[PDB]
Amino acid sequence: GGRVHAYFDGASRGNPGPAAVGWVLVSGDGGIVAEGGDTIGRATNNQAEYDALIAALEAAADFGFDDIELRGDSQLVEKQLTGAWDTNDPDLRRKRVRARELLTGFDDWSITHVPRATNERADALANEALDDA
Numbered sequence: 001g002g003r004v005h006a007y008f009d010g011a012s013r014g015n016p017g018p019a020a021v022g023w024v025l026v027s028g029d030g031g032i033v034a035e036g037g038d039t040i041g042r043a044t045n046n047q048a049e050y051d052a053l054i055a056a057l058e059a060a061a062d063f064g065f066d067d068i069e070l071r072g073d074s075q076l077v078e079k080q081l082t083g084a085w086d087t088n089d090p091d092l093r094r095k096r097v098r099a100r101e102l103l104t105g106f107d108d109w110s111i112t113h114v115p116r117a118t119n120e121r122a123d124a125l126a127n128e129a130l131d132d133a
């Protein structure tokens, strides 16, 4: 039940290097129902941006929302998730199947690109977690 706006952001210091995720669940009246930031060990930028998506989707599914609007600032995640792009990388293929599995739990979904400054919350959660690694 209900709609959520789920922001996500990855942070990584190498290819791969220490990485973290951040995510924010917002309602329509604009309350932050839940948010998170965590270190994830070593990962690339693109892995972290994907892991933050999955962490946002898991949190929204835990909260039982039925309609999710994803908001992030990674082109690569958006274009792969929507099927515009495909990748040979078997690890990012697996993260997409995982994200799509999660998405199947919602009655509706969408994804929208926001500039990073608009995504400042999730970005601060991921970076503050990574700055403490």
Ligand SMILES: [Mn+2]
Pocket (backbone or CB within 6 Å): 009, 010, 049, 073, 074, 116
């Ligand atoms: Mn980002």
Ligand SMILES: [Mn+2]
Pocket (backbone or CB within 6 Å): 009, 010, 011, 116, 123
């Ligand atoms: Mn960021």
